C-alpha cells in the first residue's frame, strides 16, 4: 500500500 | 461543480497577481486566523489495489472511499455512521444498528482506523480547527488522485487538500473562505486570505504551490 507520513 | 469553479477563479486570480515578484513581500499581512478550516485530512492509506482509500479527518472521524465509489464515514463517537452512494445519496446509521449489507465495509473501515492509529502521524496535530456552526457539516472524500509530486484530496465541503511527497508541505484550500492554509517544511501551519496574498505578496514556495494547485483543480474539474 501507500500511506501518509509514518510515526 | 460550483465549489471547484469558484476555487479555480480564486487561484487564477491570485496567480495572475504574481505575488512572489514584488519589491516588498509581506506574506504575514495576508494571514487570517478567522479562515482556519474546520476539517482537513490528517492521515490516509491508499489500498486501492484491494479496497479503496481510507482516511482520517483532524477531528478523528475516519472514512473510506471504496473502489465502488461509495463512502462510509465513522464519526469520532466510534458508532455513528454516514453512508454515501456513488450518486451522493446519504444514509445515517450506527454500527450498533447492524446493517447487514454494510457489515463487511464496516470491518474494513475498522482495519483502516486501526492501521492509521498504529502507524501514521496526525497532520496538523498541534492545530485547533475553527469551530463550525450550523451552516457547516462533516464532509466525506468525494475523490482523490495522486501525481508524481502529490496526493490531491477533494472533500464534499468544497475543500481541496494537496500533500506534497518529497518535502511534506501541504495546502488546504477552501473556496468559501477563499483561503489557503499552508503547512510548511518546519510544519508551521498558517492560513491566508487569497485576496490578501494578491495585495501583499508571498514567498516563491507558496506561490509555486499555488500554481501547482491551480493545475490540480483544472484536473478535478475536467473529470
Swiss-Prot record, chain A:
Post-translational modification Phosphothreonine, affected residues: 5
Location in or out of the cell: Nucleus
Entry-annotated residues carrying Phosphoserine: 4
Record's comment on post-translational modification: This phosphorylation creates a binding site for 14-3-3 protein and inhibits the phosphatase. Phosphorylated by PLK4. Phosphorylated by PLK1, leading to activate the phosphatase activity. However, such phosphorylation by PLK3 was not confirmed by other groups.
Job of this protein: Functions as a dosage-dependent inducer in mitotic control. Tyrosine protein phosphatase required for progression of the cell cycle. When phosphorylated, highly effective in activating G2 cells into prophase. Directly dephosphorylates CDK1 and activates its kinase activity.
Family in the record: Belongs to the MPI phosphatase family.
Self-association state and partner proteins as the record states: Interacts with MAPK14 and 14-3-3 proteins. When phosphorylated on Ser-4 and/or Thr-5, interacts with PLK1. Interacts with MARK3/C-TAK1. (Microbial infection) Interacts with HIV-1 Vpr; this interaction inactivates CDC25C phosphatase activity.
Protein name: M-phase inducer phosphatase 3
The species this protein was found in: Homo sapiens (Human)
Gene (name only): CDC25C
Portion of the parent chain present: 126 to 132 of 473
From Swiss-Prot, chain B:
Protein localization: Nucleus; Chromosome, Centromere, Kinetochore; Cytoplasm, Cytoskeleton, Microtubule organizing center, Centrosome; Cytoplasm, Cytoskeleton, Spindle
Signal peptide: none
PTM text: Ubiquitinated by the anaphase promoting complex/cyclosome (APC/C) in anaphase and following DNA damage, leading to its degradation by the proteasome. Ubiquitination is mediated via its interaction with FZR1/CDH1. Ubiquitination and subsequent degradation prevents entry into mitosis and is essential to maintain an efficient G2 DNA damage checkpoint.
Crosslinked positions (Glycyl lysine isopeptide (Lys-Gly) (interchain with G-Cter in ubiquitin)): 122
Region Important for interaction with phosphorylated proteins, residue ranges: 168-170
Effect of residue 44 to F: Loss of centrosomal localization and of S-phase progression
Effect of residue 57 to A: No effect on centrosomal localization, nor on S-phase progression. Loss of centrosomal localization and of S-phase progression
Region (Linker): 123-137
Modification Phosphothreonine, positions: 128
Induction note: By growth-stimulating agents.
Reported tissue expression: Placenta and colon.
UniProt modified residues of type Phosphoserine: 5, 80
Residues of the POLO box domain: 40-118, 140-222
Family: Belongs to the protein kinase superfamily. Ser/Thr protein kinase family. CDC5/Polo subfamily.
The protein's role, per its UniProt record: Serine/threonine-protein kinase that performs several important functions throughout M phase of the cell cycle, including the regulation of centrosome maturation and spindle assembly, the removal of cohesins from chromosome arms, the inactivation of anaphase-promoting complex/cyclosome (APC/C) inhibitors, and the regulation of mitotic exit and cytokinesis. Polo-like kinase proteins act by binding and phosphorylating proteins that are already phosphorylated on a specific motif recognized by the POLO box domains.
Domain notes: The POLO box domains act as phosphopeptide-binding module that recognizes and binds serine-[phosphothreonine/phosphoserine]-(proline/X) motifs. PLK1 recognizes and binds docking proteins that are already phosphorylated on these motifs, and then phosphorylates them. PLK1 can also create its own docking sites by mediating phosphorylation of serine-[phosphothreonine/phosphoserine]-(proline/X) motifs subsequently recognized by the POLO box domains.
Description of how the protein assembles with itself and partners: Interacts with CEP170. Interacts with EVI5. Interacts with FAM29A. Interacts with SLX4/BTBD12. Interacts with TTDN1. Interacts (via POLO-box domain) with the phosphorylated form of BUB1, CDC25C and CENPU. Interacts with KIF2A. Interacts with CYLD. Part of an astrin (SPAG5)-kinastrin (SKAP) complex containing KNSTRN, SPAG5, PLK1, DYNLL1 and SGO2. Interacts with BIRC6/bruce. Interacts with CDK1-phosphorylated FRY; this interaction occurs in mitotic cells, but not in interphase cells. FRY interaction facilitates AURKA-mediated PLK1 phosphorylation.
Name of protein: Serine/threonine-protein kinase PLK1
Part of the full-length chain shown: 371 to 593 of 603
